[PDB]
């Protein structure tokens, strides 16, 4: 704390008294010098701690306000944060069935109900283009979620039944394409 007038006064008094004492002198001069020195020393010493307490208190207050602002900010982006985190962990898991269904949904082939686990029960998906049908459906079997399923019904956007033999490269582009395959889980 060397930026206060009290420090300047105390330093000048210290220098004057020290020089006078080192020069050598009587008792009355020493007494007068110390009576004029100690008041300035106390004046300096009070502020020397008051300033420190003020500075640390200000630092703590700024810390607390930063923490409050950050918490208020954080509690307002939870949906996006959670979605990003979930997909990061889904990457890190690295499973074949999960990767299969995520890529299928990313290209457009999403399911319509909860995927069953038993050797029975119906599953319905939507196939929006011929390329997805070429990749997944070949023959009369269906490969989805690293499993095997058996096609039993095909329905178009007009809800008319389409037989499996109908679908072909050039024979397809005269149809309502968002097909709906309903299959059951092969053993």
């Amino acid at each position: 704390f060397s930026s206060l007038p009290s420090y300047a006064a105390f330093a000048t008094a210290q220098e004057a008294y020290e020089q006078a004492v080192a020069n050598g002198d009587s008792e009355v001069v020493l007494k007068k010098l110390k009576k004029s020195l100690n008041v300035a020393k106390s004046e300096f010493d009070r502020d020397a701690a008051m300033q420190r307490k003020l500075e640390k208190m200000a630092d703590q207050a700024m810390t607390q306000m930063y923490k409050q602002a950050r918490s208020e900010d954080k509690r307002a982006k939870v949906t996006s944060a959670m979605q990003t985190m979930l997909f990061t962990m889904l990457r890190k898991l690295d499973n074949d069935a999960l990767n299969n269904i995520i890529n299928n949904a990313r290209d457009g082939c999403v399911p319509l109900n909860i995927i069953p686990l038993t050797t029975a029960a119906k599953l319905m998906v939507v196939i929006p283009d011929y390329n997805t049908y070429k990749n997944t459906c070949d023959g009369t079997t269906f490969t989805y979620a690293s499993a095997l399923w058996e096609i039993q019904q095909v329905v178009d956007a007009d809800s008319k039944i389409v037989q499996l033999s109908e679908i072909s490269m050039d024979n397809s582009p005269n149809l309502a394409w968002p097909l709906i395959v309903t299959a059951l889980r092969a053993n």
Binding site: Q83, M89, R91, N113, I114, L117
Partner: protein
Amino acid sequence: SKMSDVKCTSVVLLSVLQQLRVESSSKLWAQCVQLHNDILLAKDTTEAFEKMVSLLSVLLSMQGAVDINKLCEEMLDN
């Protein structure tokens, strides 16, 4: 380490599903809660994975909900 990862992922997935107002459909919410509670009690890492597939199918079969493609282009899921 392959089991705690799937349990944490299941917790995060259930949180994401709850954020999308899924508990406004009692049957779907009951099924999701049952699956989530069953994953955390698993002991082997195959039943947990099939239940995880079943639970993720719920989120995937909601058209508007989220953007699968944007969330896959952010140096995220492949």
